[PDB]
Protein backbone atom coordinates (compact mmCIF):
# COMPACT_ATOMS: atom_id res chain seq x y z
CA UNK A 1 0.00 0.00 0.00
CA UNK A 2 2.87 2.44 0.67
CA UNK A 3 6.49 2.57 -0.47
CA UNK A 4 9.11 4.47 1.54
CA UNK A 5 12.21 5.95 -0.11
CA UNK A 6 14.87 6.73 2.50
CA UNK A 7 17.68 8.94 1.21
CA UNK A 8 21.17 7.81 2.14
CA UNK A 9 23.42 9.99 4.28
CA UNK A 10 25.50 12.30 2.05
CA UNK A 11 24.56 10.12 -0.95
CA UNK A 12 27.07 7.50 0.17
CA UNK A 13 27.19 4.00 -1.29
CA UNK A 14 26.17 0.94 0.70
CA UNK A 15 29.71 -0.43 0.46
CA UNK A 16 31.13 2.63 2.22
CA UNK A 17 32.75 1.71 5.56
CA UNK A 18 30.73 4.48 7.26
CA UNK A 19 27.20 4.09 5.88
CA UNK A 20 24.08 5.71 7.29
CA UNK A 21 20.51 6.65 6.39
CA UNK A 22 18.80 10.05 6.44
CA UNK A 23 15.36 9.70 8.03
CA UNK A 24 14.58 13.42 7.72
CA UNK A 25 14.01 12.92 3.96
CA UNK A 26 11.47 10.13 3.37
CA UNK A 27 9.06 10.08 0.42
CA UNK A 28 5.92 7.95 0.68
CA UNK A 29 4.02 6.66 -2.36
CA UNK A 30 0.30 6.17 -1.77
CA UNK A 31 -1.64 3.67 -3.88
CA UNK A 32 -5.22 4.77 -3.15
CA UNK A 33 -4.72 8.46 -4.00
CA UNK A 34 -1.91 8.12 -6.61
CA UNK A 35 0.04 10.69 -4.59
CA UNK A 36 3.72 11.02 -3.66
CA UNK A 37 4.38 13.26 -0.65
CA UNK A 38 6.98 13.81 2.07
CA UNK A 39 7.09 12.35 5.58
CA UNK A 40 6.52 14.79 8.46
CA UNK A 41 9.21 13.25 10.64
CA UNK A 42 9.48 14.25 14.31
CA UNK A 43 13.12 14.12 15.41
CA UNK A 44 13.11 13.67 19.20
CA UNK A 45 16.66 12.82 20.27
CA UNK A 46 19.22 14.86 22.25
CA UNK A 47 22.26 15.91 20.26
CA UNK A 48 20.91 17.88 17.33
CA UNK A 49 22.88 17.83 14.09
CA UNK A 50 26.19 17.26 15.90
CA UNK A 51 24.94 13.84 17.02
CA UNK A 52 26.23 11.06 14.78
CA UNK A 53 23.44 9.41 12.77
CA UNK A 54 24.43 5.87 13.73
CA UNK A 55 22.20 5.48 16.83
CA UNK A 56 18.67 6.10 15.53
CA UNK A 57 15.41 4.23 15.07
CA UNK A 58 12.47 5.39 12.93
CA UNK A 59 9.19 4.23 14.49
CA UNK A 60 6.25 4.19 12.07
CA UNK A 61 2.69 4.03 13.41
CA UNK A 62 -0.88 5.03 12.52
CA UNK A 63 -0.98 3.31 9.11
CA UNK A 64 2.26 4.85 7.89
CA UNK A 65 1.39 8.42 8.89
CA UNK A 66 3.41 8.96 12.11
CA UNK A 67 7.21 9.12 12.05
CA UNK A 68 9.45 9.49 15.11
CA UNK A 69 13.24 9.24 15.35
CA UNK A 70 14.37 7.84 18.71
CA UNK A 71 17.66 6.32 19.89
CA UNK A 72 18.13 2.56 19.66
CA UNK A 73 18.52 2.22 23.44
CA UNK A 74 14.92 3.13 24.38
CA UNK A 75 13.32 0.82 21.81
CA UNK A 76 10.35 -1.40 22.66
CA UNK A 77 10.31 -5.16 22.17
CA UNK A 78 7.50 -6.46 19.92
CA UNK A 79 5.66 -8.15 22.78
CA UNK A 80 5.55 -4.85 24.69
CA UNK A 81 3.80 -2.88 21.94
CA UNK A 82 1.55 -5.84 21.11
CA UNK A 83 0.44 -6.03 24.75
CA UNK A 84 0.02 -2.24 24.90
CA UNK A 85 -2.31 -2.12 21.89
CA UNK A 86 -4.22 -5.21 23.03
CA UNK A 87 -4.68 -3.75 26.52
CA UNK A 88 -5.92 -0.42 25.16
CA UNK A 89 -8.41 -2.07 22.80
CA UNK A 90 -9.62 -4.49 25.48
CA UNK A 91 -10.16 -1.69 27.99
CA UNK A 92 -12.11 0.35 25.43
CA UNK A 93 -14.29 -2.66 24.62
CA UNK A 94 -14.85 -3.44 28.32
CA UNK A 95 -15.91 0.13 29.09
CA UNK A 96 -18.32 -0.04 26.18
CA UNK A 97 -19.95 -3.21 27.39
CA UNK A 98 -20.38 -2.00 30.89
CA UNK A 99 -21.57 1.49 30.00
CA UNK A 100 -25.00 0.00 29.18
CA UNK A 101 -25.76 -0.94 32.81
CA UNK A 102 -27.76 1.16 35.26
CA UNK A 103 -25.12 0.79 38.00
CA UNK A 104 -22.61 2.84 36.00
CA UNK A 105 -21.30 6.26 37.06
CA UNK A 106 -21.34 4.95 40.65
CA UNK A 107 -18.78 2.20 40.03
CA UNK A 108 -15.00 1.87 40.16
CA UNK A 109 -12.53 0.27 37.74
CA UNK A 110 -10.21 -1.91 39.82
CA UNK B 1 -31.85 7.25 17.46
CA UNK B 2 -35.20 7.00 15.51
CA UNK B 3 -37.01 5.37 12.54
CA UNK B 4 -38.84 7.56 9.99
CA UNK B 5 -41.65 5.51 8.37
CA UNK B 6 -43.20 4.10 11.54
CA UNK B 7 -42.10 5.06 15.01
CA UNK B 8 -44.28 4.78 18.05
CA UNK B 9 -42.69 6.86 20.76
CA UNK B 10 -43.79 5.77 24.21
CA UNK B 11 -42.02 8.55 26.09
CA UNK B 12 -42.61 12.21 26.81
CA UNK B 13 -40.34 15.25 26.60
CA UNK B 14 -38.07 15.99 29.58
CA UNK B 15 -38.64 12.51 31.04
CA UNK B 16 -35.98 10.79 33.13
CA UNK B 17 -35.47 7.21 31.94
CA UNK B 18 -33.10 4.45 33.02
CA UNK B 19 -31.07 2.07 30.88
CA UNK B 20 -32.52 -0.90 28.95
CA UNK B 21 -36.02 0.62 28.89
CA UNK B 22 -38.28 0.37 25.84
CA UNK B 23 -38.51 3.86 24.32
CA UNK B 24 -40.03 3.35 20.86
CA UNK B 25 -41.28 0.59 18.68
CA UNK B 26 -40.16 0.29 15.10
CA UNK B 27 -43.67 -1.09 14.70
CA UNK B 28 -42.34 -3.68 12.34
CA UNK B 29 -43.37 -1.33 9.57
CA UNK B 30 -42.78 -4.10 7.07
CA UNK B 31 -46.21 -5.59 6.49
CA UNK B 32 -47.18 -8.76 8.31
CA UNK B 33 -48.55 -11.67 6.32
CA UNK B 34 -52.24 -10.97 5.86
CA UNK B 35 -53.73 -14.01 7.54
CA UNK B 36 -56.28 -12.28 9.70
CA UNK B 37 -57.87 -14.53 12.28
CA UNK B 38 -60.68 -13.08 14.35
CA UNK B 39 -61.13 -14.56 17.80
CA UNK B 40 -63.87 -14.09 20.36
CA UNK B 41 -62.82 -13.56 23.96
CA UNK B 42 -65.54 -13.46 26.63
CA UNK B 43 -65.52 -11.19 29.69
CA UNK B 44 -66.72 -12.95 32.84
CA UNK B 45 -68.39 -11.04 35.67
CA UNK B 46 -66.45 -11.25 38.93
CA UNK B 47 -69.37 -10.38 41.23
CA UNK B 48 -73.16 -10.53 41.11
CA UNK B 49 -75.43 -7.60 40.39
CA UNK B 50 -77.46 -5.68 37.82
From Swiss-Prot, chain B:
Subcellular localization(s) per the UniProt record: Plastid, Chloroplast
Domain of life: Eukaryota
Similarity-based family: Belongs to the RNA polymerase beta' chain family. RpoC2 subfamily.
Record's function text: DNA-dependent RNA polymerase catalyzes the transcription of DNA into RNA using the four ribonucleoside triphosphates as substrates.
Quaternary structure, from the entry: In plastids the minimal PEP RNA polymerase catalytic core is composed of four subunits: alpha, beta, beta', and beta''. When a (nuclear-encoded) sigma factor is associated with the core the holoenzyme is formed, which can initiate transcription.
Designated name of the protein: DNA-directed RNA polymerase subunit beta''
